[PDB]
Ligand binder design. Sequence first.
Ligand SMILES: [Mg+2]
Ligand SMILES: [Mg+2]
Ligand SMILES: [Mg+2]
Ligand SMILES: [Mg+2]
Ligand SMILES: [Mg+2]
Ligand SMILES: [Mg+2]
Ligand SMILES: [Mg+2]
Ligand SMILES: [Mg+2]
Ligand SMILES: [Mg+2]
Ligand SMILES: [Mg+2]
Ligand SMILES: [Mg+2]
Ligand SMILES: [Mg+2]
Ligand SMILES: [Mg+2]
Ligand SMILES: [Mg+2]
Ligand SMILES: [Mg+2]
Ligand SMILES: [Mg+2]
Ligand SMILES: [Mg+2]
Ligand SMILES: [Mg+2]
Ligand SMILES: [Mg+2]
Ligand SMILES: [Mg+2]
Ligand SMILES: [Mg+2]
Ligand SMILES: [Mg+2]
Ligand SMILES: [Mg+2]
Ligand SMILES: [Mg+2]
Ligand SMILES: [Mg+2]
Ligand SMILES: [Mg+2]
Ligand SMILES: [Mg+2]
Ligand SMILES: [Mg+2]
Ligand SMILES: [Mg+2]
Ligand SMILES: [Mg+2]
Ligand SMILES: [Mg+2]
Ligand SMILES: [Mg+2]
Ligand SMILES: [Mg+2]
Ligand SMILES: [Mg+2]
Ligand SMILES: [Mg+2]
Ligand SMILES: [Mg+2]
Ligand SMILES: [Mg+2]
Ligand SMILES: [Mg+2]
Lengths: 92, 62, 88, 100
Amino acid sequence: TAYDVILAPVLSEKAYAGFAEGKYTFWVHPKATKTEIKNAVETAFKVKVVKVNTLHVRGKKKRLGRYLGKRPDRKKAIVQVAPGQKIEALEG
Amino acid sequence: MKLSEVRKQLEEARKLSPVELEKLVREKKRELMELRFQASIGQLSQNHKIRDLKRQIARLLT
Amino acid sequence: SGKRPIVANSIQRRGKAKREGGVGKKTTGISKRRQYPNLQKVRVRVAGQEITFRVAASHIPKVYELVERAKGLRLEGLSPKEIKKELL
Amino acid sequence: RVKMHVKKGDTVLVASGKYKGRVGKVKEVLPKKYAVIVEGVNIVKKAVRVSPKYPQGGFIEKEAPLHASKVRPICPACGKPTRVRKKFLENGKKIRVCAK
RNA sequence: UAGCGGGCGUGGAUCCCUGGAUGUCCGAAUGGGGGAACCCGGCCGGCGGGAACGCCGGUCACCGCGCUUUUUGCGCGGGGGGAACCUGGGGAACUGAAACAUCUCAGUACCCAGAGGAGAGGAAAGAGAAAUCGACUCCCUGAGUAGCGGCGAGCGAAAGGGGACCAGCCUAAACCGUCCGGCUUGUCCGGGCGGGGUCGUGGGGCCCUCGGACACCGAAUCCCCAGCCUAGCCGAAGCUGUUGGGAAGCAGCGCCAGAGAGGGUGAAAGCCCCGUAGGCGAAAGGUGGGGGGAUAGGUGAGGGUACCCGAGUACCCCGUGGUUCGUGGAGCCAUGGGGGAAUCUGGGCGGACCACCGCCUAAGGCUAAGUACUCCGGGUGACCGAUAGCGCACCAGUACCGUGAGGGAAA
RNA sequence: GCCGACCCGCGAGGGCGGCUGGAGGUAAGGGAAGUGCGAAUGCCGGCAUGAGUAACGAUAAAGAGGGUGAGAAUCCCUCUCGCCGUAAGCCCAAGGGUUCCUACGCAAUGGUCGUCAGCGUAGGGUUAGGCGGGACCUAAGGUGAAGCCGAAAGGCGUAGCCGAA
RNA sequence: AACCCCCCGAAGCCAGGGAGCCAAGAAAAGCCUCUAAGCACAACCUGCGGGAACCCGUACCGCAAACCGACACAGGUGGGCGG
Ligand SMILES: [Mg+2]
Ligand SMILES: [Mg+2]
Ligand SMILES: [Mg+2]
Ligand SMILES: [Mg+2]
Ligand SMILES: [Mg+2]
Ligand SMILES: [Mg+2]
Ligand SMILES: [Mg+2]
Ligand SMILES: [Mg+2]
Ligand SMILES: [Mg+2]
Ligand SMILES: [Mg+2]
Ligand SMILES: [Mg+2]
Ligand SMILES: [Mg+2]
Ligand SMILES: [Mg+2]
Ligand SMILES: [Mg+2]
Ligand SMILES: [Mg+2]
Ligand SMILES: [Mg+2]
Ligand SMILES: [Mg+2]
Ligand SMILES: [Mg+2]
Ligand SMILES: [Mg+2]
Ligand SMILES: [Mg+2]
Ligand SMILES: [Mg+2]
Ligand SMILES: [Mg+2]
Ligand SMILES: [Mg+2]
Ligand SMILES: [Mg+2]
Ligand SMILES: [Mg+2]
Ligand SMILES: [Mg+2]
Ligand SMILES: [Mg+2]
Ligand SMILES: [Mg+2]
Ligand SMILES: [Mg+2]
Ligand SMILES: [Mg+2]
Ligand SMILES: [Mg+2]
Ligand SMILES: [Mg+2]
Ligand SMILES: [Mg+2]
Ligand SMILES: [Mg+2]
Ligand SMILES: [Mg+2]
Ligand SMILES: [Mg+2]
Ligand SMILES: [Mg+2]
Ligand SMILES: [Mg+2]
C-alpha cells in the first residue's frame, strides 16, 4: 500500500500555476505524514521530492431538502520536485 | 463469472505466492490509482472499471 | 471496616429510648444506630519481618493460634502483605 | 427473496381491462413493483424529456408497466394456470395438463 | 434512487441461510497522556538512500489465584453492558391516623454491589399434638381465621388439606500411608496430597468374627442419535356473455374442496395472483437424556473398644432485627458487646420457668424441575385508527429549549 | 358531506327527495362500553377584534448626474455635503466555524425597496524547523505508585505523572 | 527621484540598572560545573561538511449585523497601535 496515500490531482488555477514552477499538488489521505507523502509520491512518479507542504480542508456543508449535510474532509498536499524534472501525467 | 476465472489464477499465483501476491496487488493498486487519476479529469473514465478493479484487489488480497 | 479472621462488617440497628414503669405501662421514641465491632490492632513477629492485624477483640487468640500453624509452613524473602494471604 | 411470481419473458395473455383478451410477448418484468411489460397498456407521454441531453425525447406512446396478476401464461391451449414437475434431474414447469 | 455514465447474469448472478476473512479511531480501553474519537513513546522485524524522519505488522495496563524455591517470567481468570425479572448491603418522606410524636405509608421509592436465562431456597439441631406429616420453590385453600395494635388508623401469619414439580449428593473430624521444613531431634508438631468417612431405627473410626467376592444401584459429567430453531418447496378447481373507465357485480352453463381463514388484482373471486388444508427439506452452525451407551460414585451382619461427629460456636447476660408478635408472661431464627463448655450419660427445640412425654442432630459446601420477567421473534384481539394508538405510522429522542442533569414537538 | 317548506315520533331521533362523494356499510332481536360538551383564567389547532391603527430600533445628513435593469430614494460609478478619528480606524486573543473570494439568482431571511447582502445553487480559497501549541519544565489544583480510611458507591495521599498567557 | 541636515522624545530598549520603604516579594527544566555506577579503541566539548527536521492551527468576523443578550438588540467583552 502506497498508491493509497495519493488520492487525486487538485484542479485549480492555484494548483496549475504550481506546474509552471516545480510544485505539483494533489489530494491525500487524511492521516498522512508529510514525510510518508514524500516517500509515497516519490516512488509513485519516479521523481525526487525536496519540500512538502500540507493543508487540511474542512469540507464545506451542503444540504438537500429539509436534511442537513456535511461533505467529507480532505488533505491538500503540495510537493516541490527536485529542480529539473516533471510529472507528465499531472501536466495534462 | 469472472470470479471462477481470477480465483484459480491466485492458487496459480503460487509460483511465488506471498511475493507475487504483494507484487500483483501493488500493480493493480497502481492501475487503480491511474484509473481514478484519469477518472477525475473526466475525459478518460467510463465507470465499471473502478468497482471491478477494487473488488479485484480484494479477492487478490484474500 | 472489620475484615480479618473475624469477618464482622459493622451493622446498624435501632436504639429506642423508652419511658415507662414496666409493671404499669410503657412508651417509646425510636432512632437508627450503627453498632461497631470492638476490634483492635494485633502486631506479631511471625518468622521474618513483623505483621499487624486489624482484627476484632473476639477472635484475638485466633490470630495467635494461627501463628502456631504458621510454624509448620515454609516462608521467607520479603513477604509483608503476601504472608497474610498465605497465612490462611 | 420470494419476490418471484408467475411467468417471465415469453408468450402471455392479458385479462386486464382496457386490453382484455389480448396477447403478446412480455419484454420486461419488474418484480419490485410486481408488474410486467407486454404490448397492451401503452399510454402517450407528452413530456419532451426529463434530461436535457438529446434535445428530442419523444411524444412516444410507449408500453406502460402492467400488474403481473392480470397477465396469464399460455401454450398450445390458450390461457392456463401453472403446475410444476421436477424433471428427471432439474426443475421444469408444466402447464394445466401439458408440458412447459 | 430516478437521471448523467458504465456493466453483470442459464459457465447460473442479484437476493436469503450457515460458516469464514477484513474490521480505521473512541469506548471496560488496558504501552503513556488526555478536554471520548486526539497527542506521545519503549522492545522485535520490515519498508524508503534511510543513522537523525516517517510509516507498517507483532508486543508492553491493573487486580485475583496456581506454577515460578528467589528475582523475573509462564498459564488461567477478572474488569464493562443488558428492557424487566432476581438476591444481598443500605433505605426515605409526603400520606393515613381527619392534629401528631409510637404506629402507617414500607423495607415501598431511590442508591449500591452481585447473579444468569433465570435468581433465591433446599435434604430438618424442621413443623406441632395427630403415640401424625417428612427438603426446597410456586398456585388453590386455610383466612381476613390465629394473633398484632397510641387494642386507634390499621397490620397480618403458620400448621393442615388440594395441585405443579420431584433429587438427591460431596466434604471436616477420629484412623492409615506419604511428601515438605521446623525444632526443644521426637514413636512429633504442623502444612499439602492420597485412602478412609457422612448418620438420627444414631452414624463413622479401630480390633475380632462373617465367606466376603462375582452382581445390584447409577449420574446432574461425557459420547452418538431422534426431534427442534436458523434459508426454503410442493400444493385441487372456470369459460363466455352482460353494464362499466375498470368485473370479481348481474346472467348462463360447469368444477374443486383434508384447501369456503385472510390479502391482492382498475369494483363485490373458493376455482386469476399470493395463500390456506395437507404434506416435503439441511452441507453448515445453535439446541438436545427425548432415546441409547460408557464413566464417576454407591451397597451387608454381630460382639467388644468408647477414638471422632464441624468453636470464641452452643449456652447465659446487655443492645437489637426478623416472625403475626410495638417488652408484652416473649419463646423461636439471626447477632454488635462481655463471659464461655461439652461429643451421644453429648447438645437444640415443642412460646418465660420446672418436671415428664416427644420431635431433631447446629456452628462446612453443592443440587435440576415446577416459579418471575420480556430487549428480541411469532400468534391472536366484542384494542386504537393520525388531537387516537408507543413521545415517535413520516430519516424522532430528532428539530427546537436548557451551562447542565433533563425537557421535548409538529408532520 | 351540503339543502328541504315533505312524512313519522311529545322529545332525544328516525324516514324520504335533490346535490356532492368514490367504497365501504351492517335490519329485526340480543350483548359489551374509552358512549353524547357551551362554559373548567379547560388542552391542541384554525380564524377574528383592536387596525390599516402604534411602530419601523439612536436627530451623524443628505443632494444631484450617469450606468445597470421587467422594475431603482435603497445596487454600481462620479461630484457636492455631513459624521467618527484613545474611534465610529488598525493589529491580537476568546468565542463563533465557511459568514472569506467568484460566477448565476431573488420565493423566504433583511422591520420598506433591492438588480444588493453576512440570503439561495455552484466553484474555488487556509501551504511554516524559526509565529502559536505539542514530541520541554513546573504553579494552584487534579491525579495517584506505596501507605491510611470508609456498610457499598467511595475519601485522604508522599514519590511520579498531568496542569500555563 | 531625492533619500541628507537640525529639533522634541518615550511608559519601550540596554534590564537582573540604581535609590528608598515595609506588608518582605513562585516553582521545575533548558544552561554552567562536580563526582558514582559504567566506560576510558568509548564518551563528551569545539570547528567544518553532508544529511535529516514530524503531528495540530493559519479563510473570514473579532467593542460587533458574524461573539454573550430568542432579533442585522442604543446593552456586555480582555491585550497592543492610536498621527
Ligand atoms: Mg501544518
Ligand atoms: Mg470474648
Ligand atoms: Mg444508489
Ligand atoms: Mg527458573
Ligand atoms: Mg407530616
Ligand atoms: Mg398537620
Ligand atoms: Mg411494616
Ligand atoms: Mg435454580
Ligand atoms: Mg402454575
Ligand atoms: Mg395465601
Ligand atoms: Mg396493605
Ligand atoms: Mg479426602
Ligand atoms: Mg470415595
Ligand atoms: Mg422479640
Ligand atoms: Mg454475640
Ligand atoms: Mg451438616
Ligand atoms: Mg441454584
Ligand atoms: Mg375502530
Ligand atoms: Mg441554547
Ligand atoms: Mg387608534
Ligand atoms: Mg405613526
Ligand atoms: Mg425604468
Ligand atoms: Mg427576495
Ligand atoms: Mg424584504
Ligand atoms: Mg435582475
Ligand atoms: Mg504539587
Ligand atoms: Mg484523589
Ligand atoms: Mg501532591
Ligand atoms: Mg507537562
Ligand atoms: Mg507555554
Ligand atoms: Mg501610549
Ligand atoms: Mg512607606
Ligand atoms: Mg566531570
Ligand atoms: Mg494567514
Ligand atoms: Mg450592536
Ligand atoms: Mg440595523
Ligand atoms: Mg471596556
Ligand atoms: Mg502617543
